[PDB]
Paper text:
Legionella pneumophila is an opportunistic pathogen that causes the potentially fatal pneumonia known as Legionnaires’ disease. The pathology associated with infection depends on bacterial delivery of effector proteins into the host via the membrane spanning Dot/Icm type IV secretion system (T4SS). The Dot/Icm complex of L. pneumophila is one of the largest known T4SSs. The Dot/Icm T4SS has as many as 300 protein substrates, a striking contrast to the H. pylori Cag and B. pertussis Ptl T4SSs, each of which transports only one virulence factor.
Numbering used by the authors:
A (entry chain FC): 77 to 152
B (entry chain KL): 42 to 65, 88 to 236
C (entry chain Kf): 208 to 266
D (entry chain LH), J (entry chain KH): 311 to 361
E (entry chain JK), H (entry chain KK): 38 to 188
F (entry chain KD): 23 to 162
G (entry chain KM): 113 to 320
I (entry chain Kd): 24 to 160
Write the structure that this text describes.
């Protein structure tokens, strides 16, 4: 209860720091979600060392969005 | 009578009304007033307020909190800290020949040009406020640095609060 | 080569160029790179050239 | 959920929608007990009792 | 929580502030500003006349300084020494270096948990007082130790 | 003698602390990506060219808004005593914009409204006829 | 050709006078018309007379006035200081100097324009300073009762007025600081009709 | 209704008419018709003699009018300033603009919930009375705020 | 007498940091939008402006959703102007709409040409009282 | 065990190591209730329950 | 050079030495891992990782 009213206390700042609509592309599509990785090292077993510098992953593919999302779906 | 806006930049006179209400022992009021307006007592009152002072030999330094003595996110001034401002003027009246340097400092977050602009604006406002009491303009020089050096660390929340400051140095010769 | 205004009076203009070429330039006169000069205004810092451009203060 | 109103739906995303000649709006989507609208540039919430 | 420490061991901020009060009333200057701290000591109460040797009564004061330094957690401690103009420049440089080296060695011999000790002397290159009447009794002749409190 | 440090205020909250330390990294990421965008493509012109200022455009306003655009610019035109024009088809997807500013000029407010709109819509102003028009994006 | 002092109700007119320095003193209605490229370091006139000089290339000069003179000077003057105590009227077209200190006591009417790195001006009473088109990097204005100031500060503006004093700027400073004591006033005085006029920004928006 | 609110926050029409009666006894004029409400304030209790500077006593009246504007719900409020002719047109136009600007900034700093606040001052181009004997003492110098209550 | 601070003062240091972070991200997003925004020039923008004929000054109400030819025939009939066609209609003709209560014919046709975009345009001649509907090849 | 921190694990050995662009480190390894790191040149231990 | 994924760990604890000998001890502890260069005319101290694997 305390954290919910404290979250509600600063409503405009959440919208200020999170705006999906500025990142919404012109055909009403959410940009896809990615992840990065720098200086990866895997030791699978003996006699085998795998080393990579950078790597990237598409987590979620892009899709249509009727309306832009909000912080209330993620932090409330 | 008194004006909370800086007494219209007029010379304050507390001891006259102090000895008036003491007569209503005028000499008792006078010795009480020279006790109260003394350097030790005004330093004690400025330490009751949130103002830091350090004397180290001859160079003397004054530290003002931006977040409490300023209007927020602006070069505008906080207004309620006018008794602390009057105490600042009364203390700095005692050094009528010292050369003055004034500087501003902020935290780590934002554009470097933005921090430099904000610190320069705050330092220039402090310079103009000190000049507004009639001090000669060649006696002072203002500079607003960004996050070049801070007395605390910016990773800690309270230390990053401590990082922004107003610094007033003055020599003796 | 661009030029800029430094001092402006009603009637006469004081202009120094980008490389430091000074000019006590009259309203009826010839200017290099722009032909002649058409208009001089003091309340707004705008000088009209005969080549068809407005030259102002720097920024 | 089928909702007839004159406001602008914000939170859950609607699946289909229509507008009148009056400009009043009809939205169709799934169910949720909460709703979000922008009334006059100001955000407001709505409770769906009886869901 | 019963098996976890409530505080850092050997810590009492009341003792810290009262011994800092004792230090300032003994005139050894302690500067607290932000997370950074400075301690300045006059050399006339510590060493001989232009000499890198110690009076025996100074060891109690040095023990008190080390005991105060026990109360904090640190990373690096910087030691500088300063003097007045006596004969040359190099003479004062080496005297300040020797004095700072000796006090750094004794502070390391005492068990204060520091990772890095830096030490140097500067002679009389940077005064802190324009009034330079005195010799070894001048306030510019001094020894400074600086650090920043880590968390 | 008591010893104080001049930052002293009301007590904070840990969730506020966590939000601030997340948001500073978010803002730093936005700053570096804006630097990358500026260095990878140069600016060309300014929207002050298509929308210049004029007289009676300086009656200032402090504005908070988090909704659609049509009634907002209608209020702007009614305050400005200007003719208002709507051009193009309103899209099925509503365009929602947020503005929080204090005592600015109306032309600059229109310009930042245009910038927040982006490719969805544009604003043109003809002060000789005192007409402000909002044109939609003829797309899809 | 080193000195010229005139007194006693005469008119002196000359042209094409080249000099490194001459000591000029004017009194008792010296009607002076000069049309030469004069380089000089010191000039003095009492007042109650007109003087029109075209062409001055001076590395340094200093003028003190006591009467009520009317002076117009063409050329380029690297000026230092000015003090006015009567009913003076002065106009200088171009001045490329660095630091100026101006004191005005009774009545002054000065027409100045040029480049100034640092300027300070004190006004006491019934004193006018129309320093429009005079660009100052640092501007300091201190005005007592019944003072008129029109400034053109570009970067850093500092202004204080006691009572019934009008200070009007004509350029948007990067940094602005103004204060009024009893009835002072500091105003913007722009045109509202410029097609490329800038408004208040984040850093200079100090609300009066 | 046990969980749903019965009224808006801080609502009492007796207090509304009480502060209206007290304000009209003070001298500031409150106009009410249909949905539109106006408030006219003379410059004598607000500013000094033709200057955009606030006396210290004005802030109690500022807090009172902020308390009155806290009572209702509205979208857009507009403040218009009027004055007398003193030297020019530009001087009093800039003066009215500055006074309207600073009072709008203070009102927006205060927590009266409105989305848009327009601030303007026309100088002296729309007089109300031909009785122009006074200057700032003349009642044509004024500041009035207007809004329409929505729902 | 008494002056009060604003109610929503950022008294907390974390609130101050959050607010300036919001300021920074808003400014950064504004810079992103400014560097992204494509601006057509207001001079050589291809939009037929108001020709300002006296027949075009009338005000009317029109609701329509469909083709363009009979619509502009009605407009030319109301303006008492002749009308001509250049080009041919495609297989799929113009599908446009306009619904308004009080509008003048000049900006009605300007909105018509804006909805037309690129495949067709119009030209107005008030010297010889005609309107021409031009297709694209 | 999967561990995210900004510190440098020393003792128990890890199966894979991953790094961010902002001083953050992640490791995966076998299960252990105990760890040993170096914080700022000083070596420290770590106790983890719930295993 | 880039930081290798396997960290480079140095254990040195001595008392009251000059920094040049300190750096020489550090480079000897590194061995084939890294090298240390100092150019005092330009007042620049640099390290260099091993270009390997």
């Amino acid at each position: 209860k305390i954290i919910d009213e404290q979250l509600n206390k600063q409503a405009r700042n959440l919208d200020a720091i999170y705006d999906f609509n500025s990142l919404v592309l012109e055909h009403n599509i959410l940009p896809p979600v990615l992840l990065e990785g720098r200086n990866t090292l895997n030791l699978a077993d003996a006699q085998s060392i795998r080393i990579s510098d950078r790597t990237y992953k598409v987590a979620k593919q892009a899709h249509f969005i009727t309306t832009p999302p909000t912080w209330r779906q993620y932090l409330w | 009578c008194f004006h909370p806006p800086y007494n219209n930049f007029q010379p304050d006179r507390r001891a006259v009304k102090r000895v008036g209400v003491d007569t209503g022992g005028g000499t008792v009021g006078l010795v009480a007033s020279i006790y109260r307006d003394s350097k030790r007592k005004i330093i004690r009152d400025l330490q009751k307020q949130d103002i830091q002072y350090v004397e180290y030999g001859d160079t003397r330094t004054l530290i003002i909190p931006t977040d409490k003595y300023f209007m927020f996110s602006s070069p505008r001034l906080n207004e309620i800290c006018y008794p602390g401002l009057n105490n600042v003027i009364r203390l700095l009246n005692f050094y009528p020949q010292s050369t003055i340097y004034v500087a501003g400092f902020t935290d780590n977050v934002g554009s470097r040009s933005h921090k430099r602009k904000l610190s320069q604006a705050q330092a220039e406002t402090m310079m103009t406020f000190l000049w507004a009491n009639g001090i000669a303009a060649k006696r002072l020089k203002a500079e607003g640095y960004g996050d070049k050096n801070a007395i605390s660390d910016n990773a800690i929340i309270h230390g990053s609060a401590q990082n922004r400051r107003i610094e007033i140095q003055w020599f003796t010769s | 080569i661009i030029y800029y205004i430094q001092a402006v009076i009603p009637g006469r203009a004081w202009l120094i160029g980008s490389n430091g070429s000074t000019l006590t330039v009259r309203e009826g006169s010839k200017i290099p790179g722009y032909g002649m000069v058409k208009l001089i205004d003091s309340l707004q810092g705008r000088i009209l050239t005969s080549s068809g451009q407005v030259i102002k203060f720097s920024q | 959920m089928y909702v007839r109103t004159n406001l602008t739906i914000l939170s859950p995303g609607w699946l289909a929608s229509m507008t009148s000649a009056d400009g009043t709006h009809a939205y169709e989507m799934q169910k949720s007990p909460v709703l979000l609208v922008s009334w006059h540039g100001k955000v407001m919430q709505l409770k769906v009792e009886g869901l | 929580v019963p098996k976890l420490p409530c505080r850092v061991d050997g810590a009492c901020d009341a003792t810290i502030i009262k011994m800092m009060t004792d230090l300032n009333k003994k005139g050894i200057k302690v500067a607290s500003v932000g997370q950074n701290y400075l301690i300045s000591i006059p050399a006339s109460a510590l060493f001989a006349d232009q000499s890198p040797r110690l009076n025996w009564a100074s060891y109690s004061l040095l023990n008190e300084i080390a005991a105060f330094l026990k109360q904090f957690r640190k990373i690096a401690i910087t030691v500088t020494s300063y003097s007045s103009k006596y004969v040359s420049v190099k003479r004062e440089r080496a005297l300040t270096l020797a004095r700072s080296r000796v006090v750094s060695e004794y502070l390391w011999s005492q068990g204060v948990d520091s990772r890095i000790i830096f030490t140097q002397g500067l002679g009389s290159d940077k005064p802190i007082t324009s009034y330079t009447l005195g010799g070894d009794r001048s306030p510019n002749a001094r020894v400074e130790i600086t650090f920043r409190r880590a968390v | 003698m008591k010893f104080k440090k001049p930052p002293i205020n009301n007590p904070s909250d840990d969730a506020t602390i966590k939000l601030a330390e997340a948001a500073v990294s978010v803002s730093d990421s936005m700053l570096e990506m804006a630097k990358v965008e500026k260095v990878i493509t140069p600016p060309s012109k300014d929207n002050t060219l298509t929308i210049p200022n004029a007289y009676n455009l300086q009656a200032r306003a402090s504005v908070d808004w988090s909704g659609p655009i049509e009634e907002l610019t209608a209020r702007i035109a009614k305050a400005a005593h200007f003719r208002f024009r709507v051009l193009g088809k309103s899209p099925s997807v509503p365009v929602l914009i947020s503005i929080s500013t204090k005592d600015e000029s109306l032309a600059e407010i229109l310009r930042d409204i245009d910038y927040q709109a982006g490719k969805k819509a544009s604003i043109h102003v003809y002060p000789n006829s005192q007409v402000v028009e909002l044109r939609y994006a003829k797309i899809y | 050709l080193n000195r010229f002092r005139y007194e006693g109700a005469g008119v002196v007119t000359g042209n094409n006078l080249r000099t490194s320095y001459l000591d000029l003193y004017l009194a008792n209605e010296g009607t002076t018309r000069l049309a030469g490229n004069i380089g000089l370091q010191k000039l003095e006139a009492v007042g109650n007379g007109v003087t029109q000089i075209n062409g001055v290339s001076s590395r340094n000069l200093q003028i003190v006035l006591k009467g009520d003179p009317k002076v117009l000077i063409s050329g380029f003057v690297n000026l230092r200081q000015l003090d006015m105590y009567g009913k003076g009227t002065l106009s200088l077209y171009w001045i490329k100097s660095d630091t100026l200190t101006i004191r005005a006591k009774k009545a002054a009417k000065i027409q100045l324009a040029g480049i100034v790195n640092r300027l300070d001006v004190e006004l006491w009473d019934f004193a006018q300073f129309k320093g429009k088109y005079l660009r100052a990097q640092r501007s300091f204005v201190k005005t007592h009762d019944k003072s008129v100031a029109e400034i053109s500060a570009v970067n850093h503006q500092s202004s204080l007025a006691t009572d019934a004093s009008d200070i009007y700027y004509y350029n948007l400073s990067k940094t602005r600081a103004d204060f009024m004591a009893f009835n002072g006033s500091v105003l913007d005085m722009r045109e509202w009709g410029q097609s490329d006029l800038k408004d208040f920004d984040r850093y200079n928006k100090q609300f009066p």
